Each structure stands twice: as C-alpha cells, then as structure tokens.
From a paper:
GMP synthetase (EC 6.3.5.2) is a glutamine amidotransferase that catalyzes the final step of de novo GMP biosynthesis, whereby it converts xanthosine 5′-monophosphate (XMP) to guanosine 5′-monophosphate (GMP). The generated ammonia is used by the ATP pyrophosphatase (ATPPase) domain to catalyze the amination of XMP to form the end product, GMP.
The crystal structure of this mutant solved by molecular replacement was determined to a 2.8 Å resolution. If compared with the structure of the single mutant, the GATase domain is rotated by ~120° and translated ~4 Å, again when holding the ATPPase domain fixed. The electron density of this double mutant revealed a crystal structure that is not only more collapsed than the wild-type and single mutant enzymes described earlier but also significantly less structured, resulting in bad geometry, as can be observed from the Ramachandran parameters. The monomeric nature of the double mutant in solution was confirmed by Small Angle X-ray Scattering studies, as opposed to the solution dimers observed earlier for the PfGMPSwt and PfGMPS_C89A enzymes and confirmed herein. By all means, besides presenting an enzyme with a partly destroyed substrate binding pocket in the ATPPase domain, in PfGMPS_C89A_C113A, the interactions that are critical for ensuring correct ammonia channeling from the GATase domain to the ATPPase domain are modified. Hence, mutation of Cys113 to an alanine precludes the enzyme from resting in a conformation in which ammonia is in the correct position for attacking the AMP-XMP intermediate, as observed earlier in the 85° rotated enzyme.
Residue numbers in the entry: 6 to 233, 238 to 341, 344 to 389, 397 to 486, 496 to 520, 539 to 554
C-alpha cells in the first residue's frame, strides 16, 4: 500500500498530522530528519511533509536537509510540502531570508489572500510602510493565478489557522508564488506548481478549525492517486469508433502536451488525425517555414496541413484597445466545425484531441481569467475524448519522457493561443512585430546557448501603438510554474525591462 511520511524538524505536534494523513487510509510513520536515503528509495512514497515551529533560522544547527537528498527528491518528481518551519526551510534550500518579526502569530487568525485581485480588500495591508495603495504586494510578489485546485471543492477565503511562531518568513523563493498573507504575517504560504512544492506557514492542528482539515484529505489524494496509480494509459485503450464514422482528431499550437499526445492518438496506420490552427510565424518564427515539416517529421509518417493563421492583421480591425475585443479572438483549437474535418466524417461522431491539461482546463471550468489566456474552446458539439485529467504541467513537460524528444523544442518556451494580438494595442503593420521576430524568440535563441533556460522559464512581447501619444514595446520575463508570476529577475545587472513596480503592468499588461 501507499504511504506519506514526515521529515520532522520541530514537531511538538505530529501525531495530529499522522492522524490526518491516516484519517485518509494512507500509511504514515515517524523518521528522523537525518534518515538514510537507501532506506526510503525502495518504497512507494510519493509525498513527504516537513514539520516545525519557532526555531530560529539565524543560528544554524537548527534542523536542515542536505543537498544530494534535495536533488534526490526533486529528480524523482515527488512533490514537496512544508509546514511553517518545514516550509520556512524549504524556502531556505531554495533561497532563504528570515529576519526578525517583533510580533507573533498565535492561535487561529483570519488569513484572506488567495487570488490575483486584492487591492482595497485588505485592512491590515497598511501594517508596514504607510501603504495607501495595496497594489504594492501584488507588485513585489504574486500568487498562482489558477485559483484553487488546492483546497478543492471549497473556497472559504477566511482561513483561521493555528500558529505559534515569533519569527516570520520575509522573502519569496524562486519560481515565485504566494498562497497566503495573514494579518501580522503578510506571507503565509508559498507553493510551486510544476515541482508541486507546497509550503504553508499555518498549522492545522486541533479540531475546532476547518478547511485546514480537508486540505490534508484532498492533499493526499490529489497530489497522488494512491488507493486507486493511473498516470498514463487508462483512457487511451478506450475508443470504440465504429467503421469510418470517425477517428481521432488533434488540436495543436505547438505543444509538449501534444507533442506526445500525438503519439497517444496516433497508433500509426499511415494516420488517423488532423491538426488545427498554427503555422503562425508568431509561433517559433523559424518554424513557420519549418513548423509543418517538423510536425510531420518528429514522427515520420505523421501528416500536416492544419488550416492555420500566420500572424495578426493591423487596422483591418479596431485601431484602439477594447478590453472585450482586444484578444478575444481565439485567433486560430476547433474554432470551426464545418471543414475542420477534411473528410465528411460524421458531424458529432468525430472525436477530438486538445492540449488542455487539468491545470489548463481548470481556468476553463472555473472563473474565466482576467489577465491571461492560453487556449480557449476549452465535451460537446463533437465527441467526448476526455484526455484532460491525465497529468499536470511538469508531468506533460516530462511527457517527452522516454520518447527522448529533441531538447531544442523543450528549450523553446510554450506559446498560448492569441499571438501578438494579446497586449498589442490597436492598429500596427509591417514596420511592426507580427511574425514574433522580437522579444520572446530573441530570449529563446540565447536562452538555449548562453545558459538561461535552466533558471528563467518564459518571456513574451508587449507592443503599444494606438496613437503617437506614444508607441512603445516593452520587454519582461516570467519565472512561472503555475499560470502567473512575473517579477523582476536579475539578468547580470527604448525597450524596457522592469523599471516600473511590476503592476500596473501585468504579464500581458
């Protein structure tokens, strides 16, 4: 049977967490924080938690996990979860800055920071530095846009959680993300999506508090499907499809998710699917003349003639920015029902693929995003293939897996679905970027060979030419696992990087 364990740092309360992880019939027991690797390498553990309290980070000798073991754990693709001091130090292994909080956090106090949408709400935001406008937090630090897969099926934004810590965590780690920000302690959690490194300064503990409790249930089960694993395979050998009434179909935008989903749908046979939208020079400019060749050639007998956009017209449309009509185009994923199918395959009986992930279809199922859009049209009007729900973002970046796919395609960063219709305002033309011959790919080309993809995750272009008030184009980069975090990174210290406080500019301002 499966098992979740503890690497305990300072747990005067750990039988409650064994009570938790075991309320859910999953196996849990105690081990020292200096427990041998050779022991834990044999067994079916896909979760490890850390527990601690008000132990000082300033004076070493306080509990600590070594490197080779950190590498060991990050390589096996097992997610990491720390509680207060455990997360205090998951932020030190990966970064590290904990100064002195004259105040404490004790007992159960209301914590209410959970989304990328928090200005006037917070009352304690003026607890330091005379913050007349609470966009400062949103600027210097940012949360995972994708609302709440954490705390699934509930959103009580008031989490009144047990704590007892005099010292406070003061800084954000890499792949910056911030799940909570309390009253006295305006930082209360930090979680990275792809590595799924959770960290929470609040201690659930005794039974008078709720929300905190179910977190461990959906924790155990949603980080890892233990008792019932199915991480690939299941819904694939699951396609009747009678006669030539229908075969599989693929939606594309240049996707790792679908670089191998191709194969999942393929089954060879000369072929059985078709591609949809994206020869766009916008997407990998070199692969516009070479996009459909490579999409035919990574697996040789593949096929390619997706009806596809190439860039974005200028003032054919609005010569201004209308928040409704700026970007609202999918631009290129279904979009058309008529002759998207090159054979008069049956109207609805024909199947479909999409590169939509459980973390990517969840923007869809949930609240439609304010700032950022990847790939819309996401069942209905077609045929339910249900491949979404299979695995996550890092899981499908690794979906290249044993397919041992070319690494220069993984060094290139993903592309959503709008193009430079997102955050490019109004008219424009040829003397302007339409084949994405600026920002993004620039970075990409020296992200591969100078050595920056290892640390930096993504980058894009933002052009602004509605009048000539002014017509600029401004650069910036993002270090994101989840779908939003774009803070200032130290590239070895009139295009602009990050002179502004991050907002009032966004990933796509």
């Amino acid at each position: 049977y499966d098992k979740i364990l503890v690497l305990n740092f300072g747990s005067q309360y750990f039988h409650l967490i064994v009570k938790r992880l075991n309320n859910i019939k999953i196996f849990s027991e105690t081990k020292d924080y200096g427990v041998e690797l050779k022991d834990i390498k044999d067994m079916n553990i896909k979760g490890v938690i850390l527990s601690g309290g008000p132990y000082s980070v300033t004076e070493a000798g306080s509990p600590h996990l070594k490197k080779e073991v950190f590498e060991y754990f990050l390589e096996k693709k097992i997610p990491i979860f720390g509680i207060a001091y455990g997360m205090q130090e998951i932020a030190v292994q990966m970064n590290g800055e904990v100064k002195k909080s004259k105040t404490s956090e004790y007992g159960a106090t209301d914590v209410n920071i959970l989304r990328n949408d928090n200005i006037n709400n917070i009352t304690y935001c003026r607890n330091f530095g005379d913050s007349s406008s609470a966009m400062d937090l949103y600027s210097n630090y940012k949360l995972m846009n994708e609302t709440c897969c954490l705390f699934e099926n509930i959103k009580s934004d008031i989490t009144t959680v047990w704590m007892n810590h005099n010292d406070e965590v003061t800084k954000i780690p890499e792949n910056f993300y911030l799940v909570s920000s309390s009253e006295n302690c305006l930082i209360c959690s930090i979680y990275n999506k792809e590595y799924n490194i959770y960290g929470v300064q609040y201690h659930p503990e005794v039974y008078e508090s709720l929300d905190g409790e179910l977190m461990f249930y959906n924790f155990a089960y949603n980080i890892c499907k233990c008792k019932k694993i199915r991480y690939h395979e299941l819904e694939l050998k699951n396609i009747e499809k009678y006669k030539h009434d229908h075969y599989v179909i693929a939606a594309m935008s240049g996707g790792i998710d679908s670089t191998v989903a191709a194969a999942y749908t393929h089954k060879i046979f000369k072929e059985r699917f078709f591609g949809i939208f994206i020869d766009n020079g916008l997407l990998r400019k070199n692969e516009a003349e070479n996009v459909y060749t490579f999409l035919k050639s990574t697996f040789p007998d593949m096929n390619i003639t997706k009806i596809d956009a190439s860039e974005n017209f200028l003032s054919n449309l609005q010569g201004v920015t209308d928040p409704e009509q700026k970007r609202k185009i999918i631009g290129k994923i279904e979009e058309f029902e008529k002759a998207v199918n090159n054979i008069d395959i049956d109207i609805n009986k024909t199947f479909l693929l999409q590169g939509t992930l459980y973390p990517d279809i969840i923007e869809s199922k949930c609240s439609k995003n304010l700032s950022d859009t990847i790939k819309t049209h996401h069942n209905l009007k077609f045929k339910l293939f249900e491949p979404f729900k299979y695995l996550f973002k890092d899981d499908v970046k690794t979906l290249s897996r044993e397919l041992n796919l070319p690494e220069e395609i993984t060094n290139r960063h993903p592309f959503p679905g709008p193009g430079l219709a997102i955050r490019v305002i109004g008219e424009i033309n040829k003397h302007k970027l339409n084949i994405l011959r600026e920002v993004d790919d620039i970075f990409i080309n020296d992200l591969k060979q100078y050595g920056l993809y290892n640390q930096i995750s993504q980058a894009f272009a933002v052009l602004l030419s509605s009048k000539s008030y002014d017509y600029v184009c401004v650069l910036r980069a993002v270090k994101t696992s989840s779908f939003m975090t774009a803070n200032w990174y130290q590239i070895p210290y009139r295009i602009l990087y990050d002179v502004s406080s991050k907002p009032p500019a966004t990933i796509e301002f």
